[PDB]
Scaffold this active site. Structure first.
Site, PDB file in Angstrom:
ATOM      1  N   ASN A 139       3.053   7.387   2.398  1.00  9.83           N
ATOM      2  CA  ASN A 139       3.361   5.789   2.333  1.00  9.83           C
ATOM      3  C   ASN A 139       2.908   5.595   0.967  1.00  9.83           C
ATOM      4  O   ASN A 139       1.775   5.509   0.534  1.00  9.83           O
ATOM      5  CB  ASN A 139       2.513   5.172   3.227  1.00  9.83           C
ATOM      6  CG  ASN A 139       2.648   3.526   2.904  1.00  9.83           C
ATOM      7  OD1 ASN A 139       3.483   3.162   2.388  1.00  9.83           O
ATOM      8  ND2 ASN A 139       1.688   2.710   3.633  1.00  9.83           N
ATOM      9  N   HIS A 183       1.862  -1.952   9.815  1.00 11.12           N
ATOM     10  CA  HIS A 183       0.716  -1.249   8.800  1.00 11.12           C
ATOM     11  C   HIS A 183      -0.507  -2.299   8.822  1.00 11.12           C
ATOM     12  O   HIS A 183      -0.252  -3.462   8.662  1.00 11.12           O
ATOM     13  CB  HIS A 183       1.168  -0.973   7.805  1.00 11.12           C
ATOM     14  CG  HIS A 183       0.332  -0.123   6.763  1.00 11.12           C
ATOM     15  ND1 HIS A 183      -0.233  -0.762   5.834  1.00 11.12           N
ATOM     16  CD2 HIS A 183       0.209   1.203   6.335  1.00 11.12           C
ATOM     17  CE1 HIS A 183      -0.970   0.105   5.116  1.00 11.12           C
ATOM     18  NE2 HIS A 183      -0.641   1.305   5.568  1.00 11.12           N
ATOM     19  N   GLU A 212      -2.073  -3.583   6.164  1.00 11.47           N
ATOM     20  CA  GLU A 212      -1.714  -4.267   4.898  1.00 11.47           C
ATOM     21  C   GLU A 212      -0.804  -5.546   5.479  1.00 11.47           C
ATOM     22  O   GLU A 212      -1.001  -6.762   5.143  1.00 11.47           O
ATOM     23  CB  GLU A 212      -1.267  -3.537   3.765  1.00 11.47           C
ATOM     24  CG  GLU A 212      -2.231  -2.825   3.035  1.00 11.47           C
ATOM     25  CD  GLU A 212      -2.022  -1.655   2.422  1.00 11.47           C
ATOM     26  OE1 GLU A 212      -0.815  -1.412   2.074  1.00 11.47           O
ATOM     27  OE2 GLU A 212      -2.799  -0.668   2.297  1.00 11.47           O
TER      28      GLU A 212
END
Ligand code: BR
Ligand code: BR
Ligand code: K
Ligand code: K
Ligand code: NA
Lengths: 246, 247
Positions: A9, A93, A95
């Site tokens: 990622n 994810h 985030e």
């Protein structure tokens, strides 16, 4: 007999020159045939990355929305991702959940739509520090997994990623034993709530701190099937993680 | 020093390479007037693609960006990436970002400052909701939004202000020429008092919200409407007529 899965990622990092260089390095590396490698570039570079990367490495989008087209300035759909030659999307994810406030309901909708459109999904789950400290690791992560599961019909194109958010930028270290512990509970949930075949075949990859010098001990854990790599994915050392089971 | 007519096409989350390729082919063949500054904003996955295909006369914009140059923000892009793909603009503060994805005024201001610092132009979007219009506080709302933008703008040369009433976006209910002119008048007066007359007279204030080939001419004729931000109709052959609104 779960195939080792290593996702990189890149997050919001890099430009054409530096990423082209990173890609050059990955193309030059030997990737074990028993290792499935996926790279997730910034959204502006999905097309660029797919063009430059060896077909042996797959490309993933870092996010997508939950319908095929619409008035959603700043979003992309699974259809666009496929159109650029990418075959995966990362959803849920930490985030997105904790900086951009994406809810479980929304994440579930995204998973259902991505799978319907023919993408594979790297579905991320994980508890924060306050959640772990209150003893609700299981509650939190089972709930997140259930929302994902409720939107998956065919698990063959799903990989689950456990992110120990409690041990990412908190000062805490997750030991391999603590990682294995959660992965085992997750696989148990699959076995108990879906089927033995799904539990046995579904990759559950680790999204905590991994480096060239930590990946061996983590990869050794029986229920850890690979990694979703953050910062290390931008460096030549990513090749060493790809080769963890060698 | 006349304000150059400005027409932005916001493709939103629409298109694939095939259909956007055809869209682009039509624009390339249309010969846009040198008298119009045209900008197209593709889905983020197609910024690079659009720039490669579009005639250099037409600029490319991103539909959004984040507020730092690199970092741990999975799913975001930075102004540096946008510039690197050959785009020269970013749309910030669009209604959809504010009201579907909950982007705060403070965040938008931070994005504006960073984008300008990184050498991009900014199309900064403001606009009131229906309840706000039916109540009669349009002016207070857009002044507040504009101040947040202005607080983060030191040089207005690469800023365009886009007034898009939320009730006009995707609803088909285009604001009347009078409604648009009235808001644009006030915004220009805000710029005069709070920044400078020079900025007030040189800054394009464009209208968006159901702009179509049929409504563009009369809206464009209003003295304080300097062009358009076009959503739905930017995906259609109609877009060329809007570019040619003053012709
Ligand atoms: Br389509
Ligand atoms: Br628009
Ligand atoms: K293992
Ligand atoms: K005018
Ligand atoms: Na930590």
């Amino acid at each position: 007999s779960r195939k080792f899965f290593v996702g990189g990622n890149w997050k919001m990092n890099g430009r054409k020159q530096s990423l082209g260089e990173l890609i050059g390095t990955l193309n030059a590396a030997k990737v074990p045939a028993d290792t499935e490698v996926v790279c997730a570039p910034p959204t502006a570079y999905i097309d660029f990355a797919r063009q430059k990367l060896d077909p042996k490495i797959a490309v993933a989008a870092q996010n997508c929305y939950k319908v095929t087209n619409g008035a959603f300035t700043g979003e992309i759909s699974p259809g666009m991702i496929k159109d650029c030659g990418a075959t995966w999307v990362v959803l849920g994810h930490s985030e997105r959940r904790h900086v951009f406030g994406e809810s479980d309901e929304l994440i579930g909708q995204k998973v259902a739509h991505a799978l319907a459109e023919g993408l594979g999904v790297i579905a991320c789950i994980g508890e924060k520090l306050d959640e772990r400290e209150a003893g609700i690791t299981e509650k939190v992560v089972f709930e997140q997994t259930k929302v994902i599961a409720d939107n998956v019909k065919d698990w063959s194109k799903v990989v689950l990623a456990y992110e120990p958010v409690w041990a990412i930028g908190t000062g805490k270290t997750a030991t391999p034993q603590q990682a294995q512990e959660v992965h085992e509970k997750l696989r148990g949930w699959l076995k108990s709530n879906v089927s033995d075949a799904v539990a046995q075949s579904t990759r559950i990859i680790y999204g905590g701190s991994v480096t060239g010098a930590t990946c061996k001990e983590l990869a050794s854990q029986p229920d850890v099937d690979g990694f979703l790599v953050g910062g290390a994915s931008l460096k030549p050392e990513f090749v060493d993680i790809i080769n963890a089971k060698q």
